[PDB]
Design a protein around this motif. Structure first.
Motif, mmCIF file in Angstrom:
data_model
loop_
_atom_site.group_PDB
_atom_site.id
_atom_site.type_symbol
_atom_site.label_atom_id
_atom_site.label_comp_id
_atom_site.label_asym_id
_atom_site.label_seq_id
_atom_site.Cartn_x
_atom_site.Cartn_y
_atom_site.Cartn_z
ATOM 1 N N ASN A 38 -4.015 9.090 -1.493
ATOM 2 C CA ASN A 38 -5.322 8.694 -2.012
ATOM 3 C C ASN A 38 -6.436 9.050 -1.023
ATOM 4 O O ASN A 38 -6.256 8.743 0.151
ATOM 5 N N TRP A 104 0.135 7.595 0.112
ATOM 6 C CA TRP A 104 0.956 7.309 -1.068
ATOM 7 C C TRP A 104 1.948 8.449 -1.349
ATOM 8 O O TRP A 104 2.971 8.184 -2.002
ATOM 9 N N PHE A 165 -14.125 5.355 -2.522
ATOM 10 C CA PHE A 165 -12.947 5.906 -1.834
ATOM 11 C C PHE A 165 -13.251 7.345 -1.372
ATOM 12 O O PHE A 165 -12.746 7.793 -0.331
ATOM 13 N N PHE A 202 -4.603 2.436 -6.383
ATOM 14 C CA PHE A 202 -3.818 2.677 -5.171
ATOM 15 C C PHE A 202 -4.034 1.606 -4.089
ATOM 16 O O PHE A 202 -3.039 1.032 -3.597
ATOM 17 N N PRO A 203 -5.279 1.256 -3.672
ATOM 18 C CA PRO A 203 -5.401 0.241 -2.626
ATOM 19 C C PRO A 203 -4.931 -1.118 -3.111
ATOM 20 O O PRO A 203 -4.486 -1.940 -2.292
ATOM 21 N N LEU A 206 -1.253 -1.457 -2.255
ATOM 22 C CA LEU A 206 -0.769 -1.444 -0.893
ATOM 23 C C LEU A 206 0.039 -2.706 -0.615
ATOM 24 O O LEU A 206 -0.385 -3.804 -0.999
HETATM 25 CL CL LIG Z 1 -4.955 3.361 -0.887
#
Ligand SMILES: [Cl-]
Length: 290
Positions: A38, A104, A165, A202-203, A206
């Motif tokens: 990412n 990732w 991001f 994605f975050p 985590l």
């Molecule tokens: Cl991320």
């Protein structure tokens, strides 16, 4: 450091969707599969691949929803990425591979390796994902921002509406200044806000402080596998790092079998943007003995 992307495009159909990938180098040996994370794409590997392509096939896909790959109307959980990457690898008929993985892409690559251990001949990794026990293990210079990314409403306003991001995290996590041309390459897939969904999911995937539990458990499983695995490993790290600080890279030099470490100099998270030539040259030097 080069800003261009001088690679012929390739596309393969995967689960009904088209995935873009780089495919260069000689076609009669063990291919080297490069997996970004990412919010990047195969563009992250542009300056590393030319070191490897004289000797080895290089395959660098864009994850589903990212890069030049199609954008289906998915929530982009990690398990969605698992399904598409698994199908990508089979669609290319790959047997044995060497993995070169980050962020990732490293969670994908390690999870694939755990499930397909006889097909992985080496793993080069950098700034890879391990369980993060508490926020104290996240660097203070990005703690409040990533806590906000994982806060209801707030995180989507930052990542979806403000494109944080791309616009904030990339410069924050590259030591040197990125150029406008580089930034515009990274911006290209996400010009439309709706298309930023993977960047936000994605975050929120985590593995921090035990949640989300599914991801914590799968990461713990592939880390147990990696600590027991005899596969050759090549670990790149920089100072001060983000996911892998220098002291942890030194501990992994012992706690991962048959592991060689490479200090790239100053580096945060996107180490490929700070020292691509050492990452590519050291991968090229390590491949023949695999
Ligand atoms: Cl991320």
């Amino acid at each position: 450091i080069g800003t261009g992307f001088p690679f012929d495009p390739h596309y393969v159909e995967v689960l009904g969707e088209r995935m873009h990938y780089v495919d260069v180098g000689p076609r009669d040996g063990t291919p080297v599969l490069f997996l970004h994370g990412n919010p990047t794409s195969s563009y992250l590997w542009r300056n590393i691949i030319p070191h490897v392509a004289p000797s080895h096939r290089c395959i660098a896909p864009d994850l589903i929803g990212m890069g030049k790959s199609d954008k289906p109307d998915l929530d982009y959980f990690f398990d969605d990425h698992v399904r598409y990457l698994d199908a990508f690898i089979e669609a290319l008929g790959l047997e044995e591979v060497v993995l070169v993985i980050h962020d990732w892409g490293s969670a994908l690559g390690f999870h694939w390796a755990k499930r397909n251990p006889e097909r992985v001949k080496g793993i080069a990794c950098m700034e890879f994902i391990r369980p993060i026990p508490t926020w104290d293990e996240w660097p203070e210079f990005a703690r409040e921002l990533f806590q906000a990314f994982r806060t209801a409403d707030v995180g989507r306003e930052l990542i979806i509406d403000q494109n944080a991001f791309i616009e904030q995290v990339l410069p924050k996590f590259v030591v040197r200044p990125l150029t406008e041309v580089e930034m515009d390459h990274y911006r290209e897939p996400f010009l439309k806000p709706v298309d930023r969904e993977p960047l936000w999911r994605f975050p929120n995937e985590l593995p921090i402080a035990g949640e989300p539990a599914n991801i914590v458990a799968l990461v713990e499983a592939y880390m147990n596998w990696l600590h027991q695995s005899p596969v050759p490993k090549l670990l790149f790290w920089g100072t001060p790092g983000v996911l892998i600080p220098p002291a942890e890279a030194a501990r992994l030099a012992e706690s991962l079998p048959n592991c060689k470490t490479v200090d790239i100099g100053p580096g945060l998270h996107y180490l490929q943007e700070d020292n691509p030539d050492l990452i590519g040259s050291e991968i090229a030097r390590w491949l023949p003995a695999l």
